[PDB]
Structure formats: structure tokens, C-alpha cells
Amino acid sequence: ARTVVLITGCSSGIGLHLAVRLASDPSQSFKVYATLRDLKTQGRLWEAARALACPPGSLETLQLDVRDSKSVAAARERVTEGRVDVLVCNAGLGLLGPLEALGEDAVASVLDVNVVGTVRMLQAFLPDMKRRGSGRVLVTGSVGGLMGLPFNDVYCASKFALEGLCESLAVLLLPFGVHLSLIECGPVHTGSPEEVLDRTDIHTFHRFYQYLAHSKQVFREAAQNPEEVAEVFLTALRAPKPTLRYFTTERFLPLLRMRLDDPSGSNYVTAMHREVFG
Amino acid sequence: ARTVVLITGCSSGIGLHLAVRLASDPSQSFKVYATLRDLKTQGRLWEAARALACPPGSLETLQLDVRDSKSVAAARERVTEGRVDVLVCNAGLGLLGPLEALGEDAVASVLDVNVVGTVRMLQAFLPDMKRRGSGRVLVTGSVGGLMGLPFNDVYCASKFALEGLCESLAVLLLPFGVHLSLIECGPVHTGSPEEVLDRTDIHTFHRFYQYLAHSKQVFREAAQNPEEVAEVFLTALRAPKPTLRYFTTERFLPLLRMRLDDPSGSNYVTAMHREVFG
């Protein structure tokens, strides 16, 4: 009997590639429920399933919208085996811009998806793992959940919020046989300017499109294959005593060293200001 | 007038005490706007103010509910000086419990008050500080924002979120002349047991009560007074170049240094499990 996997946010990126990576695994150990907010976006996932030739029955799609605890319950029930061995909380939104230019609705949505969404999935699925005494939870983490990034203020808030949610749980889950791990990802290959101008000062406006210039270049240098990222999830699954945190790259570990060296936080602020601007 | 300070969450606790501390300064250096979710609760604040003979016009109250961006904008407009020199984001909620046992709404309230509420203040008050080239922001933080605490998953999520919000902002804010600081509080003085078993499991139920007993005894030994913490906001207030973070206590700097040491997190997790579950 196979390892049942359920994964959120499989329409693209990490979730897509991780789902087909598990379904197509030559061992045929994995039964994957790939869940999508909107089933109409499932096309690239089935293209990829065939290109890696996932066996029939190895991959199924469910609608699961992490904003809606009813969508969550209903997908849980569509799990024919009636347990989950591996849960991957991958679903996530980004949000980029000067804080004062972000809509209130966009800010709340990011917290609701990235943070509350993950709470909803843990509330539906964690008890059964606890009762049974086994299960793996993997949560897609970010470099921005480790260190703040200018103009990603709310994104980082949500990603730090996961660090805090997951670390708290993990302390409780240490002796339960349920293993929670975060997978810390750097960049990965998967308002319009007058609204931005109206809602902010001239100097922030300049610094923002400066930041976008710098950001795009880092992304060209720095963005990983998502197959390579997916494989780290695999590494974590295979681990018999998995750590709370895995990292998909070492590129950002120097900065993380320095930031945690200095517990009043001002070293990090200068270095990152410098790295990003000039 | 003076140094204009606006403080949220001033009906009791840190906010009430910082408000009167500042209003009763013998230099009369400070004009304090103490804001309350509900002005009808302003009884205790004014009692304290008179107890310290705060001069007239040293202290004023406004209604400000950090869940309503319109409440926020109305209170901004009421600042007759048309500037704020020190903004104190202090409004905060706790949530204690096994995750699966907390209501969805309670969870979303905490994030909306603690995180989104603070975003709304930053959105409303930072623009004028940037354009003016000056300003301080002080934010009530927590050791629970720097290390995960069991059964406080959502509280911690909310406090880690503030870490990421403020750090991201600070990197941008360095050339603008606007300083952001978190005041890292430790603990601070101010369903039925079958419902818990019912919504949770047997291992969890045991851990929870073990936790309750354990943490009572940290509150007896460790809990600082609101006045002591208020005093650390003053240091930060005054500092010629304030750091990103200030600590109110030494006590948890060991448990914290085990976290920063092992980025994998396995050291911190085992430590805190032992420290808590004994």
C-alpha cells in the first residue's frame, strides 16, 4: 500500500513539479492528490504527468481552495484511502510593492492564503496523523521567511508567520511520530506604475523600480530548476529523523549567518540595504 | 508643540503606562495621543494620568480600531500638529491552545489585529514620515516572535510576522531617516478540558495541561511589569540611532542562542521541548 500524498497549489511551479516527481517515481510508492484552487488550470499538470509518464492511478486532481475550510473538508473526504501520509502545504501568494501602495484587500488575502490557509490544512489533516502516530508535513518556506526583503514587506510577514507557526507546532510534535519540516527556497523558475506613483512619494517610486531592476538580475543569476527544488522535498521525506528546516540553496546562508550573529538586527539592515541598492 | 507620540492599545497595560509615563515627563517634551479601540474604556487611562498630574494638553485620547482603516485615517487627521514623531504600534491579541481546537475566526482576528492592524498604521503614518525625512516607529514585539512556543502557534505566527514586516521596511527606510524598532517583551503581568480532548487527541491533551502548569510557573518567576517594559520603549525612543530590536529581559537569550546556532532548527526544537515539558 502506497504513501498517500496531498499537495496544495499544484497548478504551477514547485507544487506542479513535486506532484509529478512523486507520482512518476520508479518505486511507484506514491499516491498523489494534487490539489488546485481552480481545476481549469490543471492543464500544465497533466502535460507534465504524461511527459514523465506517471502510471495510471498515481495522480489525481482535487479542487482545494485554502481560503475556504469547506473546500478543505470536501477534498479531505475525496481521499479514498481515508488517510494522508504526506501533506505538502505549498499553496502561496506573493505581493510586491511599497507598503503604502498595497491595497488592504491584497494584504489580507496574502495572510489569509499563506498563513490562515496553512492553519486550515493543519486543522483538517494534523489530528489524524497525531491519532495514528505517523505522518509527514512539508511546508514550502522562503528566503523571505528568514530575512526581510524591501518592498516584500507583507510577503515576508506571511513567510515569517509560517516559520513561527511551524516551529511552534514542531516543538509539540517532536515525540508524536509526526514530522513537520520547512523547505526554504530562494527564487525559482516556474499595481500599474501610475497607481504606484499616485500612492507613494517620488523617492520610494525611484527606489522601487530600482529594486525591480536589481531583483530581475538576481533572478536571472539565481533562480533554480523546480525539479531540483522538488527533489529536496524528496530528501526530507526519505530522511528517518527529518530536521525542521531544509534549504534548497546555500547562496543565502552567509547572510543568514550574519543576521543571526547580531541580535539587535542593524548589521543585517545595512548589508541588505547595500546588497540591494548599489 | 513638542515630540508628538501616538500610541495604540492604551486602555491598559504597556500602552496605558507608556502614555502616562510620557505625558508626565517634567520637561513636558511630549504630546501624547493615546488611542483606544473603544473610547468608553478610557476610565483607567485618565485615572492614571491624574495620579501623575499629567498637564492639560500633554495627553489626548482618540478612538482608533486597528481593524478599520477608516478608524485609522480619522485618528490620523485628528493630530492637530499635522505630524507624528513617534508611532507606537502596540495593539495586540493572544491565542492559547492546541491549533485544531481554535476557531477559524479567532485565528483570523488575531492576524488581523496583530499583523494587518500594524500594516494599516504603517500605511497611514509612514508616508508623512518619509516626505519629512524623519520619524520613529516603536512596535510591541515578543520573544514568541523570535522563537516558536508550543500551544501559541498563532500568537507566534503573528509576532514572527511583525519581525518580517518591520525588518523588510527597515532596509527600505534607512535613506529616508525613518527608524523602526521592535521591543521584544517576554511574558508580562496583567473551552473546558473535555472539549479539548474531544477536538484534539490523548498525547496532545496531556502535553497541553503539562504546558499550562509549566507556563504558570514561568509567569510567576519571569513576568515583567508593564512599567518596566514601558521603560525600555523610552530607551528606544531616546536612542540617537535606535537598533531594529531591543530586549526587555536577559532570561531567554540562552534558548534564543540555541536557535540562531542551528539553522536546521533541530537543536532549538529539542531544547524548547525539554525546557517546557521537563
Ligand SMILES: C[C@]12CC[C@@H]3c4ccc(O)cc4CC[C@H]3[C@@H]1CCC2=O
Ligand atoms: C514557553 C515559556 C512559557 C511562556 C512564555 C511566554 C508567555 C507569553 C508571552 O506573550 C511570551 C512568552 C515568552 C516566553 C515563554 C516561555 C519560554 C519558556 C517557557 O516555558
